[PDB]
Amino acid sequence: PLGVDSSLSFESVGGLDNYINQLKEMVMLPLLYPEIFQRFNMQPPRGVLFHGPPGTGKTLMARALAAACSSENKKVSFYMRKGADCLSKWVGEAERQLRLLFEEAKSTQPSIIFFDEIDGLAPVRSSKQEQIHASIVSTLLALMDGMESRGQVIIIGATNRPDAVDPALRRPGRFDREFYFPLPDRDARKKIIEIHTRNWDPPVPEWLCSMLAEKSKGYGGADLRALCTEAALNSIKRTYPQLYRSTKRLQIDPKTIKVKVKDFVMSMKRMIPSSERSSISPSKPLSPELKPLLNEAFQDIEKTLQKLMPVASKLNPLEEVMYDDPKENDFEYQQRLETFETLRIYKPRFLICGRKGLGQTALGPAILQQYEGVHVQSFDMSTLLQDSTQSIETSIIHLFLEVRRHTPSIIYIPDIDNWLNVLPLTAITTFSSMLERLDFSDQILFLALSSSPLSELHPQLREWFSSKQSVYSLQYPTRDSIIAFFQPILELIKASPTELPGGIPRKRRVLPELPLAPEDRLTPLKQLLIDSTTGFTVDQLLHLHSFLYQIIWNTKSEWNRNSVVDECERAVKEFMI
Amino acid sequence: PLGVDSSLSFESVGGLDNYINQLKEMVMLPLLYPEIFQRFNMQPPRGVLFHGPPGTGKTLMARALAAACSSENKKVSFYMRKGADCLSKWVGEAERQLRLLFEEAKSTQPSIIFFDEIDGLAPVRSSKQEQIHASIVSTLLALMDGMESRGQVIIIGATNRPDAVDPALRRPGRFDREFYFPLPDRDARKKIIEIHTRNWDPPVPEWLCSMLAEKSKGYGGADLRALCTEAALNSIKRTYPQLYRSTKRLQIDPKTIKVKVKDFVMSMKRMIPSSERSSISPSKPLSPELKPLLNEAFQDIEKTLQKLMPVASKLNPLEEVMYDDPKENDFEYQQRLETFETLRIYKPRFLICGRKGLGQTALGPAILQQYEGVHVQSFDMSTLLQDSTQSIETSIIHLFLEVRRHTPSIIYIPDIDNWLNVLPLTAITTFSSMLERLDFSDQILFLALSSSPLSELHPQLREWFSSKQSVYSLQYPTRDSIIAFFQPILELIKASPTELPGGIPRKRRVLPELPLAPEDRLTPLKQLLIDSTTGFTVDQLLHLHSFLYQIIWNTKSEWNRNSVVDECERAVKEFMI
């Protein structure tokens, strides 16, 4: 059956190395080196506040910390407190459980305590309720620190939000660490999936990683293990159909090890993402047959993206200090590199103008997918009108405040032709103010999408975007790209009966026992598809593509060729209306 | 490891001298001199209410008061009460803890009690809740004073806000002291940082103070100590890389004392301000290479600032009464100096008109930084639309009321060209009324910024600001200031390979053991940069400055000179479109 483990070698949360060194410098040093705390007479406190996606290192870095320190040294004890679990309606009974737990935590000397659900442990301190909201918060203040020199004990905090509570709970000088979980995307995703998949006596192929790791976006350690279990059970029922209706119990052979990539892709048909349980995010790669239709400008988007903003990230200070320099006295040499790759910028924004039905609003999610690791959100007016409890301008100042409270991050607005007709001049001039409230010298991108083409626009954008390179206009694709797009189906006309299942028999499987345990017109069709379709829009090409898919689906079984051209050609004739 | 101290000689809150003498006159005299309280038969009560930034003398003046009186005389006892810590849902049980604490506080004769979180101790007294909100407030009234001659005991209050509660809690005659904490800016900042840094056996240099003290703005005693610890640990990992992965424990040498200014500036890269945890304040000094482009008028701003308002502050009455005068009977001589430096004023305001892209909205934060110690806020419509629970005009009358409840203080509005299109005539005529609701004879500054130049304006400002010196117009800078600005990079063309890291090798550091414990075209380029750039705007100069930074970044490694002029010159040619 099932079972939980108490040993973790960072094998389901693995990849947060700089976090690991940051916590190692907090928890290892005070009793590893007990001398330099008097050589300098130094304090440094301990305590980390987790925030980010839950289960992406919430329970997983809980096991990574208890397993980390248990694998670190002997002896050491560990404590798990998950929200309100020692409380009452009394103050003086709730708390007497709490500080009996505190005094026994102080009695056991090598000891850490996990505290999760810090909102449930201590909410915001308001006096418009009963005074236990002030009482347990103040008594946790004095009983964690302030009055209480805790000595050798370590207090761990975890939330989903870094600001779900009043900042008195983060007194600066006791809880000076806060860890954000960035949900690793591609490479530590491939690391975390391959450190999972080696727990099987069949080693997995490594062409499927980072193939499956780039398919899997928005997942924790546990649900990627759920992908492991669902592909596993797909191998189970796949290998054996006789898994049903057993009152007389059965026995098995132990040689039931067969693995498919079909198991994984059926798991992808049968999955659901964790972030996409309640969200809608445009995390959509560009369509692979549409790459003949948009790679040619997509390259210009990613190159001019790279030029108008470097996407350069921070290296590890471990290897940086593994390097050494000779000169260390020169703050002028410091302000040199502090000017380097920092003062090279000015106000990241970009605009897309082009016709409707011409590759719109898919390239947006595509260039969202062409690089990751950055923080990003968009001013979707669905996400702006989603609350009415406050003003929408209060929501504007809020969301501008949180994208201010990040890394160099990404801001997007779709459909600005329809937008600015949606909200009044309150929110308009609000936003135009908030455009200028921040500096040029920070790196926040401002992607902008319009479904209307150029030189016809209200000038609100124009005074905002008077740079000649702050915009790009779109054109029709070339005929060679067109015939590149219709190429594969133009040989799928010829490969019906046994290449495709239009004429492939599907046969039955027998049950196991599992014993008892007690050609020539192709070119006039070519001049029908080309040169009579005078460079139209790509959605119309999607119409035709769907239509011919219906044609070849209905005409899926045919031998003795050149008999199935009449259906598609008259469909083109009808399409020209 | 860590540890708290019980002795403070005003070494982390040091600088509030007049506050210290004010509290000394409250707490020392009643038992120092027990005779003059019958010579005059005088009351004077005791009790101070702290308000201001927390941890900037909240916990720090708590330790300064208990350490102050403990270092004052023997014997004396101290009590610490932090919000709701003796309460219940009963009235009669909550209170019986409270006045058992009161009677034991009266039993111990030399005794003071710290009371913090006065909102959590006693909220506003409303009868639209349960009556314990009236009960504990009324019983704290009668049990602190009113009915109870407290005798010899001292009651200390502390909040963040001076008006977080109904003013019945400040009965005039028991709590007649209230201390505001002004967050000392430059000189007591240098005093407070140097009284920290002498706690190390390496004495720090004193060119870095007040250099680092003028870099550090918006910090308490504790987080400046956190700057001490982070520069300390930066020296730790900086001196020693072998601080990792030790199950077999290690031992050290005690000679690990090396200090860098690099440690501090990396701490500045890795810091976060306390006031800037949720705020956005334009506390921004002018850019040092932009000083050739705005010092010439900046001097006029600070001089005419000084003339249109003296910034003269109050001296200490200690040294003032250390001086003596012969004549003390003359209230007419009193109203002389009461007319001196008080009646010399009229209605402080100032206006900035000038073109867009021409030094705007950076000089504002700069002259905010050119002097400090004054109280200041601005009517940012982000900060005006940030709440919708009340009317925005209610917010107007509120904020006018609190800037009325201050020192001679500072009021600013940015972007008045875009403003007055943001709010209706309700808030407009509201504000114009509140312009005239106060007198000429008080000293409140009214800085005003417009991005549009002169002689083109709607006259609402003109009837408000019909003084010929109430406004200043802006011009283009001179060519000598231009070539002064482009001067340093115009020698950074010549100093690539070893002055800059474009051709400097970065080498590796070995691990310690730490043993086991069980030229000629420069002038045509000069006539390309000057005299073909016909006195343009400074943001365009920022474009070019960024562009050439990219040029020299890409061309960073070059010997055998005069080969790298072609890239920048064609960048200028492309820029001229």
Q: B361: which residues sit within 8 A by CB, 6+ positions away?
A: A436, B414, B415, B449, B451
**Partners of A296 in the β-ladder:** none
Residues 6+ apart with CB under 8 A from A136: A87, A91, A94, A95, A98, A122
Block residue for tokens 């690991």: A20
On chain A, the residues whose CB falls within 8 A of the CB of B199 are 41
Bond from prior residue into B75 cis (ω within 30 degrees of 0): yes
Question: B255 to chain A, minimum CA–CA distance in Å?
Answer: 9
Q: Which amino acid is at A197?
A: T
For residue B352, the cross-strand partners are B449, B472
**Alpha helix ranges (H) inside B486-537:** 489-492, 522-529
Nearest to A45 among B2, B509, B549 (CB): B2
For A328, which of B220, B232, B262 is closest by C-beta distance?
Answer: B262
Inter-chain CB proximity B55 and A172 less than 8 Å: yes
DSSP 8-state code for residue A163? T
- What residue has token string 């101790």? B121
Taking an 8 Å cut-off on Cβ atoms, the answer to whether B250 and A33 are in contact is yes
Cα B310 from chain centroid? Answer: 21
Site from B56, B385, B499, B536 to mutate, A interface, most A CB atoms within 10 angstroms: B385
Report residue B406 as tokens: 């201050």
Q: How far apart are CA B20 and CA B71, in angstroms?
A: 14
Contact assignment for A25 to B233 by CB distance below 8 Å:
yes
Beta bridge pairs of residue A324: B507
Scan for tokens 């080969």, then name that residue. Answer: B563
CA distance B340 to A430: 45
> Is B55 annotated in some ligand binding site?
yes
- Breaks in chain B (C to N over 2.5 Å), named by the residue before each, are 518
**A43, B2: Cβ pair inside 8 Å?**
yes
Tokens of A291: 């790459």
Cβ pair A39:B247 closer than 8 A: no
Q: How many helices (H) and strands (E) does chain A have?
A: 24, 11
DSSP class of B276: G
* Residue A197 assigned to a binding site: no
Strands A323-324 and B507-508: antiparallel
According to DSSP, the residues that pair with A323 across neighbouring strands are B508
Torsion angles phi and psi, residue A177, rounded to 5: -110, 135
On whether A247 is known to bind a ligand per the annotation, the reply is: no
Q: What's the gap between Cα B326 and its chain centre?
A: 41
Q: Which residues of chain A neighbour B249 with C-beta distances below 8 Å?
A: 32
Cα distance between residue A169 and residue A178, in whole Å: 12
Task: Please say whether the beta carbons of B94 and B88 come within 8 A.
Answer: yes
Cross-chain Cβ contact A321/B241 below 8 Å: yes
Residue position matching structure tokens 């302030």: A146
B421, A401: Cβ pair inside 8 Å? Answer: no
Query: CA of B301: how far to CAs of A415, B283, B313, B472, in Å?
Result: 45, 17, 20, 9
Q: Do the bridges between strand B111-116 and strand B375-378 make them parallel or antiparallel, or are there none, so unpaired? A: unpaired
* Structure determined via: cryo-EM
Determine if residue B83 is labeled as part of a ligand binding site. Answer: no
Tokens of B24: 């000394």
Query: Which residue of chain B comes nearest to A171, CA vs CA?
Result: B55
CA B415, B417, B418, B422 torsion-angle sign:
positive
Residue B173, annotated ligand binder? no
Q: Which two tokens stand for residue A402?
A: 């949180």
Give the nearest partner residue to A131 out of B84, B256, B501, using CB atoms.
B84
Phi, psi of A359 (to 5 degrees): 90, 10
Interface probe for B, chosen from A131, A170, A405 (most Cβ of B below 10 Å), is A131
Secondary structure in 3-state letters for B289-342: CCHHHHHHHHHHHHHHHHHHCCCCCCCCHHHHHHCCCCCCCCHHHHHHHHHCCC
Quick one: DSSP state of residue A516?
Answer: B
Which chain A residues are closer than 8 Å to B78 by Cβ?
A: none
How far apart CA B132 and CA B433 sit, in angstroms, is 42
What's the rounded Cα separation, in Å, for the pair A291 and A485?
9
Task: Map tokens 């947060």 to a residue.
Answer: A16
CB pairs under 8 A between A and B: 202
CA angle, B198 as apex, B196 and B200 as ends, to 5°?
Answer: 105
Match 């000397």 to its residue by tokens: A109
Per the CB < 8 Å rule, is B250 touching A393?
A: no
Residue type, B395: S
> Which residues does chain B have within 8 Å of residue A397's beta carbon, measured at their own beta carbons?
382, 385-386
Q: How far apart are CA B129 and CA B223, in angstroms?
A: 39
CB count, 10 Å around CB of B511? Answer: 10
CA–centroid distance for B498 within its chain: 40
Residues B76 and B111: their CA atoms lie apart, in Å, by 6
Spatial distance between the Cα atoms of A366 and A371, rounded to a whole number of angstroms: 9
Chain A neighbors of B543, CB-CB under 8 A: 346
Burial A99-121, CB ≥16 within 10 A → b, else e? bebbeebeeeeebbbbbbbbbeb
- From residue B213, give the alpha-carbon distance in Å to each of B218, B264, B308: 10, 11, 29
CB contact under 8 A, A334 and B262: yes
Orientation of helix A94-107 relative to helix A132-144, angle to 10°: 10
Quickly list DSSP for B361-401. Answer: TTHHHHHHHSS-SSEEEE--HHHHSS--SS-HHHHHHHHHH
Using CB atoms, pick whichever of B87, B361, B421 lies closest to residue A429: B421
**Contact between residue A455 and residue A420 where contact means Cβ atoms under 8 Å apart:** no
CA quadruple B422, B424, B429, B434: dihedral sign: negative
| β-strand partners of A446 | A411
Hey, what's the torsion of the CAs at B273, B274, B279, B282, to 10 degrees? Answer: -40
Compute the distance between CA of residue A362 and CA of residue A355 in angstroms, rounded to an integer: 14
Chain A's closest residue to B123, CA to CA, is: A127
Strand order in the sheet with B77-82: B77-82, B111-116, B154-158, B48-51, B177-180
Two structure tokens written together for A447: 């992607």
CA distance A415 to A384: 14
| CB B396, CB B423: distance < 8 Å | no
Contact A125, A137 (CB under 8 A): yes
Q: Which residues of chain A lie closer than 8 angstroms to B421, CB-CB?
A: 425, 429
Mutating which of B197, B262, B270 best tests the A interface, going by the most A Cβ atoms within 10 A? B262
Other beta carbons within 10 angstroms of residue A41's beta carbon come to: 11
Instruction: DSSP for A463-503, please give it.
Output: HH---TTSEEE--PPPHHHHHHHSTTHHHHTS--TTTSSTT
Cβ of A346 within 8 Å of Cβ of B82? The answer is no
CA trace torsion A561, A565, A566, A568 (10° rounding): 140
Q: How far apart are CA B177 and CA A64, in angstroms?
A: 52
Q: Tell me how long chain A is.
A: 577
| Helix locations, A522-565, DSSP H | 522-529, 538-554
Amino acid at residue number A114? F
CB A202, CB A22: distance < 8 Å: no
**Using an 8 Å Cβ cutoff, are A274 and A53 in contact?**
yes
Element (H, E) at B507: strand B507-508
Tokens (6 digits) for B489 = 């990079």
Q: Would the CB atoms of A334 and B249 count as touching at under 8 Å? A: no
Residue B551 and residue B568 in contact, taking contact as beta carbons nearer than 8 Å: yes
**Shortest CA distance to A300 belongs to which of A475, A463, A446?**
A475
Q: Which residues on chain B are in Cβ contact (under 8 Å) with A139?
A: 85
Per residue in A326-349, is it b (16+ CB within 10 Å) or e — as a string? eeeeeeeebeeeeeeeebbbbbbb
Q: Report the residue from B87, B252, B280 with minimal CB separation from A33.
A: B252
B389 close to B426: Cβ distance less than 8 angstroms: no
Q: What is the SS3 string spanning A83-149?
A: CCCCCCCCCCCHHHHHHHHHHHHHHCCCEEEEEECHHHHCCCCCCCCCCHHHHHHHHHHHHHCCCCC
Report the Cα A295 to chain-centroid distance in Å.
Answer: 24
The data reach a resolution, in angstroms, of 4.4
SS3 B81: strand
Q: Which residue has the tokens 């417009």?
A: B450
Comparing C-alpha atoms, which of A465, A481, A482 is closest to residue A352?
A465
Burial of B373 (0-12, 13-18, 19+ CB in 10 A): middle
Q: Which of A123, A130, A188, A127 is nearest to A159 (CA)?
A: A123
Which three-class secondary structure state does DSSP give residue B184? coil
CA proximity to B406, closest of B29, B13, B52, B145: B52
Interface contact flag, B278 A401, Cβ < 8 Å:
yes
B475-491 in b/e form (b: 16+ CB < 10 A) is eebeeeebeebbeeeee
Structure-block tokens of residue A527: 């001049």
Within 13 Å and on the Cβ side, how many CA atoms surround B347?
13
DSSP letters spanning A290-357: THHHHHHHHHHHHHHHHHHS----PPPHHHHHHEE-S--S-HHHHHHHHHTTTSS-----EEEE--TT
| Closest CB from B94, B269, B388 relative to A391 | B388
Q: Is there a binding annotation on residue B429?
A: no
A contacts of B87 (beta carbons < 8 Å): 91, 131-132, 134-135
List all residues 6 or more positions away from A175 whose beta carbon is below 8 Å from its beta carbon.
Answer: A45, A47, A48, A49, A155, A157, A169
Ranges of H-type helices in B108-246:
118-121, 132-144, 187-197, 211-215, 221-239
Decide if B89 and A92 are in contact by the 8 Å CB cutoff.
Answer: no
Could you give the CA distance from residue A275 to residue A223 in angstroms, rounded to a whole number? 11
Instruction: Report the chain A residue with the minimal C-alpha distance to residue B500.
Output: A336
User: Contact A343/A441 with Cβ under 8 angstroms?
Assistant: yes
Instruction: Find the length of chain B.
Output: 577
Chain center to CA of B111: 34
Burial A487-502 (b: 16+ CB within 10 A, else e): eeeeeebeebeeeeeb
